[PDB]
Design a protein around this nucleic acid. Sequence first.
RNA 1: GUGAAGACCGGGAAGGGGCGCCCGCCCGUCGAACGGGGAGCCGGCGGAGACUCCGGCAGGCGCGGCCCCCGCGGAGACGCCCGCCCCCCGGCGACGCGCACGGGGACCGCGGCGGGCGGCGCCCCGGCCCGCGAACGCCCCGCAGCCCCCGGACGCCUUGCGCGGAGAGGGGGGCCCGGGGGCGGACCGCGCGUCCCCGGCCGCCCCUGAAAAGCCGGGGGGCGCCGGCCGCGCGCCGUACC
RNA 2: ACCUCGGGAAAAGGAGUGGCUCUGACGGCGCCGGGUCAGAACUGGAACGGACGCGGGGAUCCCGACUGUUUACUAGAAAC
Lengths: 126, 91, 247, 72, 101
Amino acid sequence: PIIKPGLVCIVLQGRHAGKKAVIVEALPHNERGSYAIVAGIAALPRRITNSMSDGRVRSFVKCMNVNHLMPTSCRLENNYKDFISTQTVADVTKRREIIETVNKDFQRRILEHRDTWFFTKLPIDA
Amino acid sequence: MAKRTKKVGLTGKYGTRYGRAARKQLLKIETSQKAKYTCPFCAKDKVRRTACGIWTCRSCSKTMAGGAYSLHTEPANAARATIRRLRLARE
Amino acid sequence: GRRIRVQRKGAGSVFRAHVARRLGAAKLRANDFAERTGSVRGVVKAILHDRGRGAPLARVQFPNMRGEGRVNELFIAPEGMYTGQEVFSGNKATLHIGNILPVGNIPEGTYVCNVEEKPMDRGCLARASGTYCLVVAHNMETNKTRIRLPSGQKKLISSKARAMIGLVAGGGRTDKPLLKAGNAYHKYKAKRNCWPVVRGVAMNPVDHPHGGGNHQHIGVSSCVPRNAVPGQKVGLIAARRTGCSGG
Amino acid sequence: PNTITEENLMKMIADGRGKKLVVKSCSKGRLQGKVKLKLRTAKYLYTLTVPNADDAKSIVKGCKDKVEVQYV
Amino acid sequence: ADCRVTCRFHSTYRTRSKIVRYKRTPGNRLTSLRVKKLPNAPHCAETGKQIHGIPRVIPQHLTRQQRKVSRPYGGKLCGSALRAHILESFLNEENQALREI
RNA sequence: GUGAAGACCGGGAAGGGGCGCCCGCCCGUCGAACGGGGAGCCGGCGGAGACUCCGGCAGGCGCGGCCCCCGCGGAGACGCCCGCCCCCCGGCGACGCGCACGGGGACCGCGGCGGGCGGCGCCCCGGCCCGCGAACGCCCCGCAGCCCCCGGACGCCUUGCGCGGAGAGGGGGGCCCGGGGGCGGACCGCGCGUCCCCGGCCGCCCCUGAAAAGCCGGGGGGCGCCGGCCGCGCGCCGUACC
RNA sequence: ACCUCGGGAAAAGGAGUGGCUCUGACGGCGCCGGGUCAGAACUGGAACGGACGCGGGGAUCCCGACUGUUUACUAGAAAC
C-alpha cells in the first residue's frame, strides 16, 4: 500500500513536472480515479545570496492523479492535514492562505537544513 | 484468387521481360523487402523497410539497422552469437 | 591520338564525386583521454541513409568531454544497432555490437568493422555494406593484432587501433539484380559519372588503345605490363593469370 | 476594421482614446434597424450597429464637442 | 465570359511561394490573392511529434504566451517524453545508491 | 607554397572587441529580378502607370513621450497577453514521386425571382444579357490526424487499409487544421464535373529527395523587465512598351 | 500455335449501334437528387462510330533480347 500521507513523489505531468511533492491525504478511490492531495515545492530557494550563503520558497497545494506522481522512499512528515483538506484547496481563497502557510513551513526547514533530498531539484538531463 | 499461377506473384509487373532468372531472384528479394518483420522491442510484426539497411517498426517507432532486403541477415545472426559467446567467456 | 577516358577522369571535372546532400564523413569517434582510460557513453539519435553509400549511417551523440555541450558523431552502422541504443567507445568497453574498443581488447574470432589501419586514424577498413574484419591473433609482445581484411589478406595492425564490434548493415545488397539500365543510372547518379560504359573496341583508333578496325577486336593481348605508360594501361594490368578456372 | 464592444468600450474610447470622428450612418441604403456609428481611431475604425434611432441618441448624447460628428 | 486573369507575382514561374487563390472582388472581378506556405509548428526534439498548443504561424507574429506551453521543457519536449525523462533521471540516481549500499 | 616569370596553388598561421575584465583555433557585404525571405488589399483617376498615384481600409519593422508593473488556472492534454542577456540543447525556415480517396476555393451548369433586350410566317413563361463583395480585425465552428482522463476488451473500422493489454471500443475532453460561417470592412436555392490548393493514408527506391540568413522556444546561470496608449519614421535601385 | 507462363491478344473471326415512346435498376424519404447501366415496343429508300476522331490482318525467315542512344545539315540501323 505505497500511497500514504507522508510519501514524497515526483510530479511527472503538468506545469509542476519534475518537482518533488508530498502527499498530505490519500483521496478516497472514486469514479474520477485514484487521486491524492499533494503539497510540494513549485520553486526552489534561490541562487548566490552572499558567496554561497552568508531567496524565497514557493509551494503548490493541488490535488493530482496518482498515476501522474512517481513514488519515492523519502518522507517529509509534517502534521499538514490539519490545515490542508478537500473543502479547502478546492476553495478559491483558503487555498492561497494554505499555500502561504506551507511556503513558511518549507522555508523554516530549508534554513534549518532539514529534508535536503526533498529540497533538491530532480536533475532532468534534457 | 491466385491471379498469377506461377511464381510471377510480385514479378507480374515486369511482364514478358528481363528473363526467368532475374524474375526468380527478384521474387525472393522483393517479397523479403516489402514483408513485415517482428520488431525486437514492439514484438509486433510491424517492421518495414525505409531504405536499404534501415527498418522502422510503425508501432514501436524505433529504427534499426538491418540487411538491405531483410531486417536480419544470416551473417549478422551468427556474428551476434559469436560476440555473445566471446563476451560471456571473457567475463 | 586523343587523351583516353581514364586520363580525362583524373582532372575531376564531370567525373568528380556527386557529394552534394551526403551526410558527412563517416568516421570513428576521435581518441580522447576518456577513451584511452575508461569509456564514453553515446546514444544513437538516428540511423539515416548516405546518398552514395549502401550501408546505413548513424548519428550517435556523445557528451562533450572538453566542454559543456553534446558532440554528434557519424558512424557506419553495424547491423542490429537501434535508435536509443547506448554505445560505449573506450578501452574499458563491454563487447556489445556498436561499442568501439581497441583491437587488443577485442577477443579473437570477433566480427569487427570500421577498423583503424593505424591508431587514431578514425576509420579505414571494413566500411562497406555487409563487410567485416575478424580478429585472428594478438602478439602481446609486439603490441600488434593480426586481422583478416574482407579481401582475405591478413594485416598486422597495432593493438591500439580501434574497431566497432559487429558486421556493417546493408548486408546482401548486391544479391538483387539491378534488372534495368535505369536502376543503374539511379545508383551511379548518387556516386560519379562512370556509367554508361563504352567498350574501347567500340571506340575509334584515336580514343582507345583497343581502338578500331574492320572488325571489333582487341588487336594485341589485353594483358599490359605493370610498367605501362599512363595512357597505355587499358586492359588487364599485370595479370598473374587470365581465364575462368576451378577454384 | 472591428465592431466596438456595445457602447461600453465605444464611449470609453470616445471619452479619451483617439476618436478622430464618429459617423452616425443611419439609413445605410435606406434600410431599417440601421444606425451604424463609425468611430475613427488611430489603431482601427470601429462600428457599433444600434437597433433604434433613440438608442443611437443616448450614445450621441455625451459625444464630445471636440469629437466630430458626421451624418449619412 | 472570360475569367482568365494575369500573374500577380514578379515572374510567371509558379514555384511553391508563387501559388494564388482566386476570389471575386467588390467590383465583380476575379483577383489573385497570394497563398503563403503554412510555417509548421515546433516538433518535439526527442521523438518527432508536433508540440500541442502552438499555432502554425511564423513565431515572430505569434505573442509570447501563444509561442510557449505552460510546462517544464514545454515547446521542446512533449509530455510523454518529459515524463520519461523525469522517470529515467530519478531511477538512475536510485540504482546508484543501491550500488553504494 | 611553387614557377624564369606572367601567374598558379593553399588552413595550420600571435586570424576576433569596449573597460576592469571576460569570452574566442581558422574568410566571404561572392554567387539565385524562378530557391529561402517581416508586411497589401479594395475602389477610383490619366493620352501614355499602378500591388507604386489618389481615396479608404489594414499589415510589418523600428524611434521617442507617457503610464503601468515582475505569472495564475486545470485532474491532465491544454488554457490564458505575455521579460531581457550569456552559454548550452533544440525547433521553424525545409523540402521527393505516384494511383486513388476526402475537404475547401474558384470556375461551371441548372432552376427560381428581380432588372434590361432581341426576334416573332407559326410556336415561345423554350432565346440572350446583368444580378457585385477584397485584404484585414474579433467571435464561433472545422474532417482526418495527434494527445488527455476513466477504465479494462474480438472488437473498431477503409475506397484501399489500418488499429488495439505499450490500452481498443465507449464516455467525456485538449491541440493543430494555407479552410468555412457571423458581424465589422461595406438576390435565393441546388447539382455534376473541371482546375487549383490542402489533408489523412497507402505504395515506391542498390534513387531517400539542399543549405543558410533570419526568427522563436527549453535547460542552467545571471538579471529586471514586460506590456498598454499616443505621435513620427521607413533611405538605395528596378518599374513605358514588345 | 507458341511461351521465359507474365504473354501472344485488339490474335483470327462474328453480331449489334439512329430516332421516338416507355420500363426497370441504383443511392436518394420531410422523399428528394442523380445520369449511367440493362430490357422493351413502334418507326425509317435495307439507315445509324452517318461529319469528326479512329489497328488492315495472317504465315514465316535473318538480326538485335528488351525501354533507351547515335552521325544538328544525305545512313535511326543489324551499330552504341
